[PDB]
Structure formats: structure tokens, C-alpha cells
Point group: C4
Chain length 484, copies 4
């Protein structure tokens, strides 16, 4: 018993707490910080608080559905099954209320959770305690036992007191918002998907309560001869037929499809219909808003590529380039980026050295390992040099190197067919894994032959400036290269 009884009320070492406090030593400091603070204090991130709030979510989603129906469509709440259900729930929500004095609290300051018991009690008794209190105690039964020391008046007034329980929706909202921030910090939740499912739960709950209110107001007026229950001649129907019609009216007002069987006739039905129409029209506008925010997040990568490309069309149309030249540019962007939008330089700068090294070795080691230098050189040298290679793409017919031009760069074939075209011989084809232009290294001069693309070529290259920038840090390899 005791070894778990103290262990449950303080932060366990887990994927949330290690990512939140930063290390097991920071978690174990926070465990010590509550274990010194007082008797039975509960940390906000504790497993006890998780499983307790999980019981509250089940308990509240039960109560906020059952209570409106029990008050509205049944004769009395004084029978044994209703006395049992209400005393069970009220004692549970009163245990939750006293635990909100022993539990700590978080803040936007991101500082360590406030865990002094007097600091918790003084903050709670100001912030939320009054709405938690009047909805925890059985205000209707404690009024009734006082009224026991006409009957058609006291029962009605009692039904109005019984609905003070619906303020438990504040706890449902609070406890949902607390655990969704904890799931964001652990399970990579999409914000728009979380947000729309919160609104869907509220729309169903408001539509259910409205579907009670539309019958409750006639009942509190003793079913006047001009209201919808009397006009539809269903005052004596079953509780399920009445609930189905009252929910159908509420949902019809919420979606603006119609009023029910006819438009309102009495003052009560006019003003309850208009309240329902406004709560509906606002929920549906907020739902169309959330559906739009969701849909605009889903294809964000496609969208950003379309916006990026359209600025190339603005550039080409400002410069008034001819349509065949625009087709080369359009075709180049499709081969180089393949509809994927990213920034290679920005992404590699925020990685660490081990991840940059691992991604570069995966991309380029199979291409470089065929070369006679890199087959013999040190691993701590080639892994440094591969980080300097720049990716390039060439279209068919383009010259990659021209004879007689100064050779500032040398290249490696990743994909496609190239052709060396010196006048001294028949043309030699080059293919994936081969390399060319190497005679630019550690020398100077014009290129001895031209090279051109016979198909879409995907290449890697490095400049003699970047090659020298590497070799300046590896003078032993510089001496080995200078020999041949």
C-alpha cells in the first residue's frame, strides 16, 4: 500500500515529464519539491490526477446528459433510483471540490507548478470555488427538506434548483483543456482536429439541452393551451416521443430548417424559439469557421508549392520571356523539386552535426566511393568533404561543361545519361555512378572537352574554392593529393 500511496501523487518519470522538465534529475527534483511541501499535496502532472480527471470526464458526460432529461420528462426526482444517482454523483463532485484545494496549479509564466497548500487554497477560493460549490452540493434536496418544515408550486421551483448541476460544464471545459495541452506535449495532435471535436461535443450538448428547455418552459407553465405540446396534442405521450419531438424542434431551430409542425403562437414559444435560433446560427457559423481552418491546414504543402511557383510566373511575365523559354523553366521546376517545397539550407542549419553527417552519408557515399581519391582517404576527411557538394539538375541538350572555358567545378552523375564530346574521339556516354571534370582539382586551365546532357541529369558538384576550404583543414591529405 504505502509505497504506491505516496508514488501516485507526484510526477512519474515518463515521456511527458522527461520532455517537460528536461531530464530525470529535473523530474526527481520536482518529486522532492512536492514531498517536502505538505501532507497529501497533488502535483498537476501526477498519474492520480490523470485517472481522477478521467473518472470526472465519464461522470460529467453522464450527468450533463441524464440530468436535463430526468428533470424535464419525468414526474418527480424524489424516488429511490434518482435519490441514489444524485447522492452518488454529488458526493463524487464534492470529493473533486476538496481535492482542488490539495492539487497544485500551472501558469503562463511556465515556472514550477504552484505547490504551497496556502497559495493553492487562496488562489482557488477566488478563481472558481463558488461555481464549483453551488454545483457540488444537492441544493434542491436541501431546499426540499427545509420546505418540508402549495405542492404544485414547490415542485416547479425545485425543478429550477435541480439545474444548478449544469454548471459542472465549467469543470468539463477546464479538465478537457488541461488534458488536451498534455496530449499536445506527447502525441503530435493536429490543433484544428482537436479544436473541431471540442466544438462538435458542445454543439451536441447545447442541442440536447435546448431540446429539454423547449419542453421545460411549457411544463413550468402547466402546459398552456397555446403552446406546441398542447397544439400537437402530445401532453400524454411517452417520455421518448416527447423527447424525440423536442430534440427535433431544437435541432430544427439550430440548423434553421423550420420551426416544427407550425410557427410559435405564444410569447413563451416565440422567445425560446429566438434564443434557440441565435445559439444555433452562432454554433453553425463557428463550425463552418473551424471546418475552414481544418481544410486550409491539410494541403498546406501543395498550397505553398503553388504560391512559390506562381511567383516564377510573375517573374517570367514581368521580364516578358517567350513561351518556349517559359516551358523550359516550368519543366525544370518539375524535375528539380517534383512538387515538394522545402529549404535545404534552412533545414540543415537547425539539425545537429550527427544528423547532418548521417543524411549526407546516406545521399552521397555511394556516389563518392567509386572515386580513386575517396576509396583511399580517411573517413573523417571524406565525411567532411561530402557536406560541400551542391545538387544540380540539367535538361536534355544543355551543356554542363564547354571546351576552352575555365573549369571552376567538377561533377558526379546521380541519375541520367551524359555524353563527353571532345573533337579528338567518338563520343563517350556517362551514366549513374560515374564522374567527370576532375582535372580542375589542384591546378588551373581551360576544359579539355565539352560535356552535355542526353537525358534529364541529376548531378552533384563541388567548386575548387570549397575543395580548397576543406583541404586547408587536412594538410596530410593535401600532401597525398599533391603526389597524384
Amino acid at each position: 500500500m504505502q509505497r504506491q500511496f505516496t508514488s501516485m501523487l507526484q510526477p512519474g518519470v515518463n515521456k511527458f515529464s522527461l520532455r517537460m522538465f528536461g531530464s530525470q534529475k529535473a523530474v526527481e527534483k520536482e518529486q522532492e519539491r512536492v514531498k517536502t511541501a505538505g501532507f497529501w499535496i497533488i502535483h498537476p502532472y501526477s498519474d492520480f490526477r490523470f485517472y481522477w480527471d478521467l473518472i470526472m470526464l465519464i461522470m460529467m458526460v453522464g450527468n450533463l446528459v441524464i440530468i436535463p432529461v430526468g428533470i424535464t420528462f419525468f414526474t418527480e426526482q424524489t424516488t429511490t433510483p434518482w435519490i441514489i444517482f444524485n447522492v452518488a454523483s454529488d458526493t463524487v463532485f464534492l470529493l473533486d471540490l476538496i481535492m482542488n484545494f490539495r492539487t497544485g496549479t500551472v501558469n503562463e509564466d511556465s515556472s514550477e507548478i504552484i505547490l504551497d497548500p496556502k497559495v493553492i487554497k487562496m488562489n482557488y477560493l477566488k478563481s472558481w470555488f463558488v461555481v464549483d460549490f453551488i454545483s457540488s452540493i444537492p441544493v434542491d434536496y436541501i431546499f426540499l427538506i427545509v420546505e418540508k418544515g402549495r405542492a404544485l408550486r414547490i415542485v416547479r421551483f425545485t425543478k429550477i434548483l435541480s439545474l444548478l448541476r449544469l454548471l459542472r460544464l465549467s469543470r468539463l471545459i477546464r479538465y478537457i483543456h488541461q488534458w488536451e495541452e498534455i496530449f499536445h506535449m506527447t502525441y503530435d495532435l493536429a490543433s484544428a482536429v482537436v479544436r473541431i471535436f471540442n466544438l462538435i461535443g458542445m454543439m451536441l450538448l447545447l442541442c440536447h439541452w435546448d431540446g429539454c428547455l423547449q419542453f421545460l418552459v411549457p411544463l413550468l407553465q402547466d402546459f398552456p393551451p397555446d403552446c406546441w405540446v398542447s397544439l400537437n396534442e402530445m401532453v400524454n405521450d411517452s417520455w421518448g416521443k416527447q423527447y424525440s419531438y423536442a430534440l427535433f424542434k431544437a435541432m430544427s431551430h439550430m440548423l434553421c430548417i423550420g420551426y416544427g409542425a407550425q410557427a410559435p403562437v405564444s410569447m413563451s414559444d416565440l422567445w425560446i424559439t429566438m434564443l434557440s435560433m441565435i445559439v444555433g446560427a452562432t454554433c453553425y457559423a463557428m463550425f463552418v469557421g473551424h471546418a475552414t481552418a481544418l481544410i486550409q491546414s491539410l494541403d498546406s504543402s501543395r498550397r505553398q508549392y503553388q504560391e512559390k511557383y506562381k511567383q516564377v510566373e510573375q517573374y517570367m511575365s514581368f521580364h516578358k520571356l517567350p513561351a518556349d523559354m517559359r516551358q523550359k523553366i516550368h519543366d525544370y521546376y518539375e524535375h528539380r523539386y517534383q512538387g515538394k517545397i522545402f529549404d535545404e539550407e534552412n533545414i540543415l542549419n537547425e539539425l545537429n552535426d550527427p544528423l547532418r553527417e548521417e543524411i549526407v552519408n546516406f545521399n552521397c557515399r555511394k556516389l563518392v566511393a567509386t572515386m580513386p581519391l575517396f576509396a583511399n582517404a580517411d573517413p573523417n576527411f571524406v565525411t567532411a568533404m561530402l557536406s560541400k557538394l551542391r545538387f544540380e539538375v540539367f535538361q536534355p541538350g544543355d551543356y554542363i561543361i564547354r571546351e576552352g572555358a575555365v573549369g571552376k567545378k567538377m561533377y558526379f552523375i546521380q541519375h541520367g545519361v551524359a555524353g563527353v564530346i571532345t573533337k579528338s574521339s567518338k563520343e563517350m556516354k556517362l551514366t549513374d555512378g560515374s564522374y567527370f571534370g576532375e582535372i580542375c582539382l589542384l591546378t588551373k586551365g581551360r576544359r579539355t572537352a565539352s560535356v552535355r546532357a542526353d537525358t534529364y541529369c541529376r548531378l552533384y558538384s563541388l567548386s575548387v574554392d570549397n575543395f580548397n576550404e576543406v583541404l586547408e583543414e587536412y594538410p596530410m591529405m593535401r600532401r597525398a593529393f599533391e603526389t597524384v
Copy 2:
């Protein structure tokens, strides 16, 4: 009296005026600039203009609600209570009209508020004076006293003249837009929240006026036998039942739920219904628009993080990296950024030197103060050197330093467990607050031991290039470091 009487009509030194004009000397220049301009001129930003416009907002939101009801649902406006309410309001709106000749005006030029009395009078008499004038004077009572020197015709025409007061909505719009720009400049208002509450006020006001117009047109036609008031048999009901039904019709047309008890029969009811449907359908489309603009601002930080990350998935899927390597990258981004999106370099560049110094000393002074150099060095030196430290994160199993590699950097542990793993001894653990790699400073060579992460490590580091860039400005500290 006199010391306040001149003080109220010119800009006070306060959080708005000091932020607007830039200093107390610029405010006191503007006070002098109105005190020299003429008798009783009012500066736009004055406390007198604030409290006067605040009285106008209360006066207008009263009048624009009461006047449509008084004209539409009551027999005559010639009785003592209506003569009192209209003469009180009309004299107040006429004082407001003459004060709009003495008050200055702002411009999009952002230049000093136009405060010459002839320049104010010539600008106002062109821009808005005519709509302000015909809605300030009691056009109905001055028509009636002339008509007094058939009765069923003159009363009707009088009801149409009494609604020229509704042009006071132009002043309500103008004065709201002026004070909301001043609150934006003082209380950090969210623009979408301000914008949606402006539209909500207009939707309620238009829905109220429409709910009058739907009854007013039948009344001006003497309740013809084919209109909704006659068909519903409520020409003799109370003013409250008639208003409740007419508002219910208007609101039903505005939300497109239905027509009321039946579809229109007469020409008057057809064309008023269609006008109402169009004003409704446009307000509801504008409201769904504002709700969408609001919702898309609320999770902007989450959204931007999701969009930033999805470009890493585009990068990884273009390079066709294997799924286990993608899991290392996904796990690295969660530990390094924790779902927070920001640019450290961009944010620190727009701060001033005191704030950069204060943020850097808060982050790093507790880590650096354990070091033997920085425990002895000058405070104006260490505060400069801390600005060069770069934050890094390492996953478990990654090598932070390799034995025999060139040591270009040295590090400090902020969080996590590292292990030094030289072959000369058993492995030594390192933890938060410790430091390693220091032998790279003021020397050259390969690293004497390897160091690796046993858990997620959060580190700070500085390169020997940045260390030298600091020490070049502090040659006295350079001599102290060169000794040991």
C-alpha cells in the same frame, strides 16, 4: 473652475499621448499648439472629447433602439413623455453638431491634427455636416407646427419624417471607429475580436429595425386585409405581442428559417420579405467570414509549427530517407523545439543591447560561473562572451566529440547525461552544470577522448573562432588566459 476648464480641451500626459507624440516635451508642444490656435478649440485626443463621445454612445444606442419602437407600435409621438425624450435628445445631438466645428481632425498623413478653426469648419461643412444636420433638428415637430397653420394623412407622413433620426447611426459608426483606434494604441486589442463585436452590434440593430419595418409598412397602409398583421388577427394585440411577432418574423428572414406563420400574400409583404432576406443573407455571410478570420488567428503558432514541420517531411520524402532515419529526425525536432516556433537570430537582432544582455545572463550565467576562467574574469568580459554561445541538442547514442578528430568547439551541459569514454580509464559520467572539451582553447590538436550522449542532452557550445573574436577585444584577459 478655470484651471480645469482649459485643461480638459487639450491632450493630457497619459499612456496614449506619450506613446503617440513620443515624449512629454512633444505632448507639451501640442498643448501649446492648441492653446495658441483660438477660443475653446478641442484636440481630438482630449479627455473632454472622450467623455463627451462616451455620453454620445450611450445616447445613440438608446435613441436608435427606442425611436423605431416609439414610431411603429404607439399611437402618437405628441404626448408629454415623447416630447420630453425627443427635445432632450435633439438638443444633445445639436450640441454635438456645434462641437464638431470646434473639434480638430486626424488624417492618414499622420501629421499633427488639423487645429485651425476655419480649416476645421470648411472641412466639416463639406464632409458630414448635412447628414448630421437633418438628424439633429426635430424635422417632424417643425413640419407639424407648420401643418397646424386630413389628420389620417398628416400623421402617417409625420411617422416617415420621424425616422430621419436613424441617420445618427453614421455618428455611432464614426465615433466607435475613432475610439477603437485609440484603444488599439493602448490596450493590445486583438483585431478579429474587435471586428466581430462591431458586426454583432450591427446584426442586432438591423434585425431590430427590420422587425419594426415589417409592421410599419402595414401600419402606413392602414392594415390591409391581405397583410400578415390582419391574417394573424393581431391588429388589436398589445404593443409587446406585436413587437415580439414582428421581431420573430424579421429574425426568421435574417436567418432563413422561415417566413412566420405563412408565406407573403400581398405585394408589400413580398418586397419587404425579400429586402429582409437579402440583408440577412449578407449579414450572415459577413459573420461566417469574421468567425473564420477570428478562428484562423487563435492557433497561429500551432499552425505555423505544423507548416514548418511538413516542409521537413517534403525534404525527407524528396531525398527518400528510410523510416528509421525519419524517426530520428522527427524525434529530434520535438526535443529541440518542443512545438514552439520562433527565430532566435531574428528576435535577438530587433531587441536592444540591455535586453540581449539580460536574456543571455538569465540563460547562461549559472552554467558559465562554475568554470575556473569565468569565476575569476571581469564582468564586462564574460557578459560579452556569453553572447557567442550556440545552443545544441543531442539524442542518445550520438557522439558529441570523437577521439583523434580536430577539436574546433567546446561544450557545457545544461541538461541530460553524457559519458567521457577514453580508452585509458573506466567511463566517467557528466551531468547538468558540468563542462568538457576545454583543451581546444588557445592551442591546436586532435581530441584526447570521445564523449557520447547516454540520454537527451541539451548543451551550449562556442567555437575557437568565436572565442578568438571575443579575446581580440580584451587583450588583458588574453594575457591572463595565456598564463594557464
Copy 3:
């Protein structure tokens, strides 16, 4: 006559053509390029084409409103007023059709407008000529005169032929889209405002045509006993009562408020109601879409400032800074940027040298002209040096300079109160227009006194590195500075 008759058919020198072709010599080349091309060819950007299309817009918005009403709600189109209106309009739309062989055309290639008469005729006769042709000729009257060489059948079929005129909506769309691109290139139109007014015109036009179709189908069936016109007992009403009810039905289906007096009974009324509901529900969804795109453009500057600031909250909450330090940062951003978002460096880089010079002289010449160097120096020197000054802001209590620190910068007060606080004397206040720290210029050493902000200070500064970078280009001024 002749001097205008050739001048109207070719591009005039105006704000559009000079901005489109780039100069008066490029416009005069384009005038020559049409004057050589053939007899009476019309350039797309000509004044004749503008005023002709303006006549077509008035002619089409008349015809597309009048023709549906004339066919639907009147007994016959063979009477003199309808023969006159149709022959006047058909001959005008046939002149427009032959002018579309003589007018040139633009392209997405942005190349010079296609102006060869055979190249225009071959392109038009493929692209749009068939829809333009069958809607220009009077197909109904040429069918009727052939049918003249039972009456209840031929009149009905004639009403169906008369609606081939509604294909003139293709010309209305084409000519609107051409002139809106020309107004974008001249009058700084907001795209969302233009787009929403195009949709509003289409919604009104579709709603008007639907309101004809709902009556036309019953009329072509000879008013069957189960359709809405028969059930409402209005087959013998006036044309205006019938049109008002049929428009009310159409608009009710378009906005989804209801069906009219009752739901459909016949097959004709079911399928026309469902067609109307679908065209409505799609127009209203497209309108809520355009209203959202409009609203999200209007506060784009506020929005971007809120998004920029929230990344500072992500930075502060990642670094876990304390709430008082966050209040200094929040207060600093409000004083430095005042809710305005911009990039000073990006905006100044895309201006030209004259505009950079003019903006810098407006901001800084009044501050620099009090200085003893800049009161005596050359104007071509000080105008260069002012471009190096960097703007800074300091909060109250912050030290701008510390005694004994190395002075890398010197400053100028634009606004606020500073205080010099050397131990050798009582404190001296400094105010807007004064300057300090000047002893750092052309020397080296520690600062002789500290300086601190007593109120929010707005300052300009330049580093000794930037001062030297200027003076290296002005050695004559360097010699003058070296003397004192």
C-alpha cells in the same frame, strides 16, 4: 473627320499604355505596327474599343434583364415595340460580331497583341464565334417567317428559340474580365473587392432568370392543374404580381428559406425546385467564400503583427523567462514598433538611391545639423554618412553607455530624456536634438562617463566601423576631422 477616324483605332499615349509598353517611343512603335497591318484593324487597348465595349455592357445588362421578362410574362413578341427592341439590339450585337474579326487579341505570352487580320480571323472562328453567332442573329423571327410558309405549338417553340439570346452572357463575362485587368493596371483596385462585386452581379442575374424559369415551365405546359401558378390561383393576375411571386420563389430557393406557399406537387415543380436549390446553395457557398477572402485581406497588417509577436511569446516560453522580464520585452516591442510591422532593410533595398537619400534626409538631417562637424562639412559627405545611422530604443532605467567600457558607438537623441552620470559632477540632463559619446571617434579607450535613460528614449547611433567605412571614401574630410 479623318484625323480622329484613324486615331481612335490605335493605342493613345495615356497612363495605361505608357505603363504597359514602358515609354512613349514604345507606344508610338505599337501605333506604327497597327497602321502598317491593314485596313481599319483595331488594337485591344484602343479608345474605340473601350467606348464600344462600354456601350455593349449597357446593351447586355439591359437585354439580359428585359428578354427573360418579355418572353415569360407577356402574350407575344410579334408586336411593334418588341420588334423594334429586338431588331435594334440584334443589329448592334451583329456589328460587335463583325468587329471581333477586325480587333486584335492579347495572350499569356505577354507578347505584342496579335494584329494580323488573317491570324485574328482564324483564331476567333475557332474559339468563340459559334456562341457569338447563334446569339447575334434573330433565330426566332427567321424561324417564324419560315413557319409562316398549330398556333399553340409554334408560339411555344418560338419562346424557347428566343432564349438563345441569353448566350450574350458569355460576351458580358469576356468584356468585363478584359476591362477589369485594364483597371487593375491603372487604378490600384483591391482584387477581393472586384471579385465579390462580379459574384454579386451573377447572383442577382441567376436569381432573376430562375424567377422567370419557375413561371416559364408552367406556361410551356399551358398551366397544368397541379403547378404552383394554378394552386395559388394567379394565372389571371397582372404581369407584375406574377413576376414578384416567381422572383420570391426563386430567391426563397436560392437562400433556402422555404418553397413559397407550399412544397411542390408536380414533377415539373419538383425538378425545377431542386435545380434552383442547387444553383442557390452553390452561389451562397461561393459568396461566403469570397466574403471570407475579402475580410482576411482587410486587417492583414494587424494580423501579421499579432503573428510576429506570438513568436516572441514562443521564444520567451521556450527559454522560461520570468514574468517581469516578459513585461519588459512586451513593453519594448510596443515602444519600438507601435503595432506597425515592416522590414526597414528589405524596403530600403528595393527603393532607388534618390528615394533612400530623400527618406534619410527627412528623418535625420534635423538631428545631425546641430553637430559641429556636420554644420561645416560637404553636403555630398553628410548625405552619405546619414545612411549608416541605426535607430535604437531604450526603456527607463537602462544604461546606454557604461563608464570604463570600450566605446564602439556614439549616439543622437531623437526623443526622450537621458542623463549623463559621471562621478566628477552633478548629473546633466539631455533631451531631443542633443548628442553624446562623440569622443569614441578617431581614437580608442574606455568611456569617461555613464549615460542612462530617465524616460523612453528614441535614439540614432553609428559604430566607429561604419564611420571609418564612410571616411575611407572621403579622405579630404578625413584630414579635416584629424585636425580636431
Copy 4:
């Protein structure tokens, strides 16, 4: 036969596969990788799989429209035409099911498609096989032949079994999403246009099925006296009148226009109406969402230009520039960018050397070829130097060069009129194709004359720093320039 029979089941060399695998040698490796894997295995990207899925799309869009109608509005499915249609379709969907064991599969890992036959069979039998199986076999006819070894009960239950075919919508969704990703990789599809047409197909299909369900529930209850079919007295109407009314009800609930002839009376009609209202209200909210995402993509270039410009208004209003200076800046942006937004530096950096060379030679070779140096120099020199030219724009009255200032740059006229204004002579005009300021090259000094813009000038320029940076790579041209 055989030469095509093996060729159809493996990736052909085409615009998709060459862009996906990267080259013809990578495609031919993938062909070999399936040809070695087993008997008759099908690659996901094969032509056989394309034409088979195209037959499935036609087969499914037929079946999912016909089957609900056949079950709902006809007496029995045991007659010869229905036995033929169901056995033809069920055997086709069973061939599709066995082919899903022989076809490979793709993954988010982007690795080569999983093509081992045991790895395909074990993955499919877990993922989707059960929903594919119960919808391929004729579950209703195999139940009926067992029940053949009361009639009003067995037929009803049979109609419920016949709708297990509607699970073929999962295959329709899967096969559409597979081929749309392949069309994105080949035909430059806009994502929002693709997405909205997927939703439009689902809205029509759900509305059709709902329009069956609204009649099916009454039919399964044997048309009770309180349901809509009985109240409208149409139990004996034709199948087309019943379908038209049931579709009209469903579509009315989907769009929230009304219930049909009257609101529900029975429990069955209440709960089916509310199900329809919810499925409708959610589809319409998702459609308004997609229409908004579409509309916001269409004018993305206009939008981004408006947002870019409004930051210039924030800059000007922060600096409080006067209105005439703002008009120069506003006018400059319109002449320099012409409403086109792009980044010249970012776009040219992601192109290759051949495209940069081709775009630069198109823009600038006609301007440079008039110059006496560039008419004589090497083509490999001038093509390098043209890449250094920076575009500039000047407003009328602005000085481009001032006499006596240091000449760091020289210019070329692309468009507009300039004037040289030395005091030694009458003013000389300069026009498109001319050049000035050339005496700054290979020397030093103050400018011998001023030059100013008489009209909007569009210019190119290069600095002496960039000219020297070019000539340092071409010492042979440096010697030729040094001679004159």
C-alpha cells in the same frame, strides 16, 4: 500475345515512371525487380492496373447509383435482368479482390513498392480484405438459397442484406485517391480543384442514398399510416414519382430548406429526418470550407502584392513621412514592380547555369551589343559580365548622376528619356539602347557632368567593384581594356 501479356503487368517507360524512378535505367531495374519476384505479380504503376481500375471506377459509379434504387423502389431482385446485373458485377468485383493479392503496394517511406507475394498477401488480409470480401460475394442470394431449404419477413431481411454492396464505396475512395496522386505527379493539378470535385461527388452520392433511405424505412415497416408516403397518398405512384419526391425530401433536409410537404409525425420519420439534417449540415459546412480554400488560392499573387505593399504603408506611417513623399514612393512601386510580386535573387539562385545564362542573354544582350568593348570581346566573357548588371528605375526629375560626385557605377538605358546636363554645352537627350557614365571604368575621379530623368527611366547598371570582380577572371580582356 505473350510479348504484351508480360509487358502490361510492369512499369512502362513514360512521363510518370521516368519522373518517379528518375531515369530509364531506374525504370528498367524496377521492371527486372518484378519479373524476378513471382508469377503474374502486378506493379502498382502498371498500365494493366490503370485500365483495370478505370473499369472499376465505371463499374462502381454504376453499381452505387443503381443498387439503392433497385432495392428500394422495385418489388423483387429475383427476376432475370437483376440476376444478370448482380452476377456480372459480383464476379467482376471478385476478380478485383483476387487481383488485390497479386498487386504490390506503395508506402509513405517512399521505398520501392512492396512486391513479394507473401508480403502483399499478409498485408492485404489484415488491412482491407474483410470489407472487400463481404461486398464482393452475393450475400443476399446465398442467404436466399439457404432460406429456400414467412415470405413477407424473408424479403425484407433480404433487402437489408443486399445493401452490403454499398461498402464498395471504400474501393471507390481508395482507387480515386491512388490515381489522383499519380495525376498530380504528371498533369500539374491544382489541389483545391481536385479536392472540391471529390466532395461534390460524395455530396451527390450521399444525397442519392439518403433519398433511398427515406423511402426504404417506410417500406421495411410496410407503409405505416403515419409516415410521409401514406400521408402524401403515394404508396401506389410510379417508381419515378416516388424517387423524385424521396430525393426532393433528402435534398431539402441536406440543404435545410424544409421537411417536404409537412414536418415528421412518426418516430421513424423523426429520427431519419434528423440523421439527414446532420449529414447535410456537415457536408454543406465542409463544402463552404473547400470553396473558401479554393477562392483563397486563385488570387494568391494579387494578395501577396497587397500584403507586401501594406508593409510599405506601415513603414511610411511609422516614420511619419509627408503625403507628397508617400505619393513618390507609391508611384515608384507601381513603375518598378507593376503589381507583379517575385524575388529575383531567390528565383535565379534555384535555376541552373544554362537557364540563368539564357534569361540574362534574352534581357540584356541587345542593350550591351551596342557598346564598343562588348562588340569586340569574347562571348564567354560578355555572358559572364551580363550576370552582374542590376536593374534600376528612376522617376522624372531625379538625378541619376551628379557632377563632381565620385562615380562608383555606370549605366545603360532600357526605356525612357534621360538628359546629360554639363555646363559646357546645350543639353543632349539619351534614349532606349544608349549608355552613359562609362569613364568610371579602370580609373578614379569625380563625374564630369550630371544626368537626369526627363521621363520614367528603366536602366541597367554595374559597379566598378563588380566589373573588377569579373575582369580578375579574364586577364586577357583586362589587357585589352587597359589599352583603351
